[PDB]
Amino acid sequence: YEDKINVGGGLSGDHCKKFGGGKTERARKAMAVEDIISRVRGGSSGWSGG
Amino acid sequence: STPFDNEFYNGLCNRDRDGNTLTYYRRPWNVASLIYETKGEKNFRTEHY
């Protein structure tokens, strides 16, 4: 403002923020157990055993 | 090995008429009986993780 005495003044501020976050987690587990046992009382020592 | 005599026999021969081929074996008096069971088998297994 000025009146004919002058007084001067001026201000201008600017602020800005930019935040970011990201997370990723992946798990994969597999377990398999297979057992096959055959008891044969056929009567063959070697050939029956095979 | 054997801790006792396994050849001596008491009296009348006890026949052991069995086996793959045609042959006659003896069974000693020290042994009660000797069978010829020709059993045979196998086993298998698998594990994974």
Curated annotation (Swiss-Prot), chain A:
Segments spanning the bilayer are: 7-12
Where does the UniProt annotation locate this protein?
A: Secreted; Target cell membrane
Q: Tell me the subunit arrangement.
A: Heterotrimer of 3 chains: alpha (C8A), beta (C8B) and gamma (C8G); the alpha and gamma chains are disulfide bonded. Component of the membrane attack complex (MAC), composed of complement C5b, C6, C7, C8A, C8B, C8G and multiple copies of the pore-forming subunit C9.
Q: Could you say which protein family the record assigns here?
A: Belongs to the complement C6/C7/C8/C9 family.
Reported disease: Complement component 8 deficiency, 1: A rare defect of the complement classical pathway associated with susceptibility to severe recurrent infections, predominantly by Neisseria gonorrhoeae or Neisseria meningitidis.
Q: What does this protein do?
A: Component of the membrane attack complex (MAC), a multiprotein complex activated by the complement cascade, which inserts into a target cell membrane and forms a pore, leading to target cell membrane rupture and cell lysis. The MAC is initiated by proteolytic cleavage of C5 into complement C5b in response to the classical, alternative, lectin and GZMK complement pathways. The complement pathways consist in a cascade of proteins that leads to phagocytosis and breakdown of pathogens and signaling that strengthens the adaptive immune system.
Protein name, entry field: Complement component C8 alpha chain
Source organism of the structure = Homo sapiens
- Residues of the whole record sequence present: 384 to 433 of 584
Swiss-Prot record, chain B:
Q: What is this protein called?
A: Complement component C9a
Source organism per UniProt: Homo sapiens
Taxon lineage? Eukaryota, Metazoa, Chordata, Craniata, Vertebrata
Gene name for this UniProt entry: C9
